[PDB]
Amino acid sequence: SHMEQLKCCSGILKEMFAKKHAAYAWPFYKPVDVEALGLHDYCDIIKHPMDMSTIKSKLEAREYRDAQEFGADVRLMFSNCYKYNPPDHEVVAMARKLQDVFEMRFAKM
Numbered sequence: 001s002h003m004e005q006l007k008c009c010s011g012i013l014k015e016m017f018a019k020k021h022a023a024y025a026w027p028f029y030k031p032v033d034v035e036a037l038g039l040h041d042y043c044d045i046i047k048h049p050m051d052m053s054t055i056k057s058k059l060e061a062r063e064y065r066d067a068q069e070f071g072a073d074v075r076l077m078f079s080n081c082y083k084y085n086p087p088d089h090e091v092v093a094m095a096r097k098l099q100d101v102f103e104m105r106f107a108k109m
């Protein structure tokens, strides 16, 4: 049962990586680089960082038990962005645009 659901999860993540969503999805592609961004307090506020490439690696390695574990990592990635940044920040608006894509596809599986 879980194997079919995880095939759909890979399909959702692939769509999140598509050129169609690139203008707002690009900050979530790779882990937040605290050194390059100069984010001295990021590791103190964000205990469990997450990004799309890490989620892709976990799916490839068959690390997820089911679809809800995949869903939890995607939501964690968005939660970290909302937590660290004030609500008027552009990255927050981009996270919400990409979450609308994830939430739509995920609710249909």
Ligand SMILES: COC(=O)C[C@@H]1N=C(c2ccc(Cl)cc2)c2c(sc(C)c2C)-n2c(C)nnc21
Binding pocket: 026, 027, 028, 031, 032, 033, 037, 039, 080, 081, 084, 085, 090, 091, 094
């Ligand atoms: C000063 O605070 C930041 O730089 C936060 C950082 N902003 C951004 C960010 C992203 C897009 C815009 Cl338009 C402005 C800021 C960011 C990432 S990852 C990444 C490669 C970047 C450029 N990000 C995520 C995800 N969560 N917070 C951020």
